[PDB]
Design a protein around this ligand. Structure first.
Ligand SMILES: OC[C@H]1O[C@@H](n2cnc3c(NCc4ccccc4)ncnc32)[C@H](O)[C@@H]1O
Ligand SMILES: [K+]
Ligand SMILES: [K+]
Length: 542
DNA sequence: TTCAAAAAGTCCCA
DNA sequence: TGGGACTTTTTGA
């Protein structure tokens, strides 16, 4: 496949947003383009809107211009000759769209091509549509070479194709033109989006951002969506209207139009000064802005200053190396090769569940002839798969070695761990030398900062409600009740030390002591957490 | 030599 | 089919 249907409410909102206040009398030849038209979800609606626009002013146009040209009977043809433009890579979609535009009642400006390679011969008044989203794993590598060569200002490292579509749209937009598109929301906060953000802020005035957060706009699609509207007008003041959803549980058809949704109690509205955006786009209301600025100002250190961070093991084929601790095959493996192994769901606040899995740290198997039983009966079962790994085909790793085995000495110590995707802050102290995959991240404290910061104090403040809200201010929202907890944002969290250090650390130690008992009652832990939150709010003056 | 980012997620049930 | 639990390894740098 490859063609995705956009909900009609979204299409109507986008077309109306671009064409609401067009002066058809002053310009009866607007050029309106969709470079991912597909079957023409947007373009057919553009035809309807334009037909009403032209018919409403047919006699005014007849008087101001050639009176024989401007007839209702001539509207259709005119629309299809000078106004509607579409491009797509699929021949069948273009043929279907051409048939529909013909049946609305002549040369139709429909192109079957790759929009990122087409030499565009003129700019456009209005651009709308839904571009393709393809990530770094699902993109062919020759095409990635092309993108890296030609779209270097926005496409780099782990970036996405729709970054290039943003750049192309911006480049072929007329002065005073208006663009409105629906894309994934991740570029707003992702590390890969940085350059793209810089390209937008520097080249268009951003009118409006609609952030649906984790709501499901596309049925049976695992993606989170936003709508962006921007222009190239001579702007005096550059202020952005931000509509952020307040309940991800909504159904999009709650009203006849998206405008009713935006103005209702289901959304929140606020304004952001485009001139005040840094390389990061902190899009929050004034209360959250004050909260964030207080926290940033009062804190002297960051986690990056005082800690060393790392990503977990990447075996390359988990079924070959990970076994249940009760699996009989572990009798074939010397215990010097076995490590405790945990998943992201084993990380609670302040402590980790006990391990249920073992990792065969196969890097320390010297010769294949020694311990050949392990290679024959456990790892070799997936040998074919293991040989398709990149470092095996290139020869850097033997077929039975872990793909990215990291350094054991970093794991086999006291450290703090957190899951890579979570609904809330879950920072735990690891006491058991646990190993994990890339779905859990770790850090430990630098030696020179041990006397300023203990592990108990850090898990105490990082697990608080204050720091939950503070981290989620700028965190990358992925899907319903899921944020990314990656070092590129976690290590930028700022921390403090003051008169309340000792009581916070003591409360943290009490919480840890309760959580490790045979008969845990979480209630006193909740009360202690409330008291610690009061201490933190006192320290930060919020 | 070897790090860390990346949801048109994935999979399964009522 | 829609909603909830949970999260691998490929890949550029
Ligand atoms: O998904 C939304 C619609 O977008 C279309 N579309 C996807 N990639 C496109 C492209 N260049 C990118 C490209 C990437 C790899 C190979 C060729 C082209 N140029 C034009 N249209 C493209 C799909 O057919 C859908 O109808
Ligand atoms: K006339
Ligand atoms: K979603």
């Amino acid at each position: 496949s490859g063609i995705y249907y956009t909900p009609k409410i979204i299409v109507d909102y986008i077309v109306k947003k671009t064409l609401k206040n067009h002066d058809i009398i002053k310009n009866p030849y607007p050029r309106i383009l969709d470079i991912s038209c597909g079957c023409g979800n947007f373009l057919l609606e553009v035809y309807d809107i334009l037909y009403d626009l032209f018919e409403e002013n047919i006699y005014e146009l007849k008087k101001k211009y050639d009176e024989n040209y401007w007839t209702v009977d001539n509207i259709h043809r005119h629309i299809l000759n000078y106004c509607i433009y579409g491009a797509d890579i699929d021949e069948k979609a273009i043929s279907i769209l051409k048939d529909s535009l013909t049946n609305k009642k002549i040369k139709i400006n429909l192109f079957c091509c790759d929009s990122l390679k087409k030499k565009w011969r003129y700019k456009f008044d209005y651009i709308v549509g839904n571009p393709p989203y393809i990530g770094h794993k699902k993109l062919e590598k020759k095409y990635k070479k092309f993108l890296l060569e030609k779209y270097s200002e926005v496409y780099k490292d782990k970036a996405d194709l729709y970054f290039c579509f943003y750049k192309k749209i911006i480049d072929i937009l007329k002065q005073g033109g208006i663009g409105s598109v629906i894309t994934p929301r991740y570029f707003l906060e992702s590390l890969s989006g940085k350059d793209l953000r810089e390209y937008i802020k520097s080249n268009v005035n951003v009118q409006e951002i609609v952030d649906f957060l984790g709501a499901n706009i596309f049925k049976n699609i695992g993606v989170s969506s936003c709508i962006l509207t921007f222009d190239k007008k001579k702007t005096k003041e550059t202020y952005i209207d931000v509509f952020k959803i307040k309940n991800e549980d909504i159904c999009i058809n709650k009203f006849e139009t998206l405008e009713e949704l935006l103005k209702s109690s289901k959304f929140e509205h606020f304004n952001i000064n485009q001139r005040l955006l840094s390389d990061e786009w902190i899009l929050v209301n004034k209360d959250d802005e004050t909260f964030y600025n207080k926290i940033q100002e009062k804190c002297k250190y960051s986690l990056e200053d005082i800690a060393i961070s790392f990503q977990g093991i990447i075996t390359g084929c988990d079924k070959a190396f990970i076994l249940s601790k009760d699996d009989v095959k572990l009798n074939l493996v010397d215990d010097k090769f076995l490590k405790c192994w945990i998943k992201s769901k084993n990380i609670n606040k302040y402590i980790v569940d006990k391990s249920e899995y073992r990792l065969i740290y196969s890097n320390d198997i010297d010769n294949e002839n020694t311990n050949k039983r392990i290679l024959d009966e456990i790892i070799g079962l997936y040998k074919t798969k293991l040989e398709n790994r990149r470092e095996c085909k290139s020869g850097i790793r033997k077929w039975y070695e872990l793909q990215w085995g990291r350094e054991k000495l970093f794991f086999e110590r006291k450290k703090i761990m957190y899951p890579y995707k979570s609904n809330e802050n879950r920072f735990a102290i690891d006491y058991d030398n646990n190993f994990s995959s890339a779905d859990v991240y770790s850090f430990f404290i630098k030696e020179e900062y041990l006397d300023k910061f203990s592990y108990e104090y850090l898990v105490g403040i990082l697990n608080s409600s204050v720091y939950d809200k503070y981290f989620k201010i700028t965190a990358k929202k992925m899907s319903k009740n899921i944020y990314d907890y990656y070092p590129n944002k976690v290590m930028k969290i700022r921390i403090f030390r003051d008169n309340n250090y000792e009581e916070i650390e003591n409360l943290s130690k009490q919480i840890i002591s309760i959580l490790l008992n045979k008969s845990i009652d979480k209630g006193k832990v909740e009360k202690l957490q409330i008291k610690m939150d009061n201490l933190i709010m006192d320290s930060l003056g919020i």
